[PDB]
């Protein structure tokens, strides 16, 4: 047998162009529109992710939630030489898929994959992954972790003035406690980017929260 995540990977390996990150993204998006929905950020919201990366030019980018590697490929392809993406994924099989997808897309030199839970890895980023502060964070893991991991990132000293947090799914499925925190707090300057849930006409949005200092 096989799983949805394996079928998405197999579609890419068999139909996308090796070394062509854009072709990998398009193959995933086509498979998910035509065959089986999956929780990749997708094309519409992905254009917004792309725009945030282009506006901030992060040198150290952290992703929480890798899944099959769609967003890791999408983001990595816009980073400059010497920039790096650290992506944390709790499920070892998804992590294996993500590394296979990254490698196929020609992005392996940009990406450090970490297997584990964000809450376990964040407190180790400075000591084990040679992070000082982060330039940007993409939150796209289980939504009940968005608030507590944001507080962990801050308390661990990983945010600096101007660090960008970009959170998927703030409308659907929703992340209301995260939203109330960053919006209400004087420590974050927030902008809402409304769009659509991946591969659907359901409304969703992203929140961009720029840290302003403690
Ligand atoms: C929405 S999918 C990620 C999609 C990906 N960002 C993309 O756009 O291609 C969410 C993932 O977060 C992972 N996950 C859930 N809780 C986690 C945690 N605490 N730390 C790391 N990964 C987690 C899940 O195993 C799943 O792969
Ligand atoms: O249920 N969904 O439509 C989604 C969509 C998403 O984009 C997700 O990131 C998600 N999740 O992490 O649980 C779920
Ligand atoms: Mg999502």
Swiss-Prot record:
Brain, liver, placenta, lymphocytes and erythrocytes. The N-terminus is blocked. It comes from the Eukaryota. Its EC number is 2.1.1.6. Mg(2+) binds at residues 140, 168-169. GO terms for cellular component: axon; cytosol; dendrite; extracellular exosome; intracellular membrane-bounded organelle; membrane; plasma membrane; synapse. S-adenosyl-L-methionine binds at residues 41, 63, 71, 89-90, 116-119, 140. The keyword Calcium does not apply. Keywords: Catecholamine metabolism, Cell membrane, Cytoplasm, Lipid metabolism, Magnesium, Membrane, Metal-binding, Methyltransferase, Neurotransmitter degradation, Phosphoprotein, S-adenosyl-L-methionine, Schizophrenia, Signal-anchor, Transferase, Transmembrane, Transmembrane helix. Residues 1-214 are extracellular. Its cofactor is Mg(2+). Catalyzes the O-methylation, and thereby the inactivation, of catecholamine neurotransmitters and catechol hormones. Also shortens the biological half-lives of certain neuroactive drugs, like L-DOPA, alpha-methyl DOPA and isoproterenol. It is linked to Schizophrenia: A complex, multifactorial psychotic disorder or group of disorders characterized by disturbances in the form and content of thought (e.g. delusions, hallucinations), in mood (e.g. inappropriate affect), in sense of self and relationship to the external world (e.g. loss of ego boundaries, withdrawal), and in behavior (e.g bizarre or apparently purposeless behavior). Although it affects emotions, it is distinguished from mood disorders in which such disturbances are primary. This is Catechol O-methyltransferase. It comes from Homo sapiens (Human). The gene is COMT. The chain holds residues 52 to 265 of 271 of the full protein.
């Amino acid at each position: 047998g096989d799983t949805k995540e394996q079928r998405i990977l197999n579609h890419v390996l068999q139909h996308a162009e090796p070394g062509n990150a854009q072709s990998v993204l398009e193959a995933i998006d086509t498979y998910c529109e035509q065959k089986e929905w999956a929780m990749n950020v997708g094309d519409k919201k992905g254009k917004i992710v792309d725009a945030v990366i282009q506006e901030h030019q992060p040198s150290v980018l952290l992703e929480l939630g890798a899944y099959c590697g769609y967003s890791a490929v999408r983001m990595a392809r816009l980073l400059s030489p010497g920039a790096r993406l650290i992506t944390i994924e709790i499920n070892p099989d998804c992590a294996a898929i993500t590394q296979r997808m990254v490698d196929f897309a020609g992005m392996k030199d940009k990406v450090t994959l970490v297997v584990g839970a964000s809450q376990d890895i964040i407190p180790q980023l400075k000591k084990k992954y040679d992070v000082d502060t982060l330039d940007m964070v993409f939150l796209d893991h289980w939504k009940d972790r968005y608030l507590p991991d944001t507080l962990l990132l801050e308390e661990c000293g990983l945010l600096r003035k101007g660090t960008v947090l970009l959170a998927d799914n703030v409308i659907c499925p929703g992340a209301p406690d995260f939203l109330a925190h960053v919006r209400g707090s004087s420590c974050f300057e927030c902008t809402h980017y409304q769009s659509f849930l991946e591969y659907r006409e359901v409304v969703d949005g992203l929140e961009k929260a720029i840290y302003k200092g403690p």
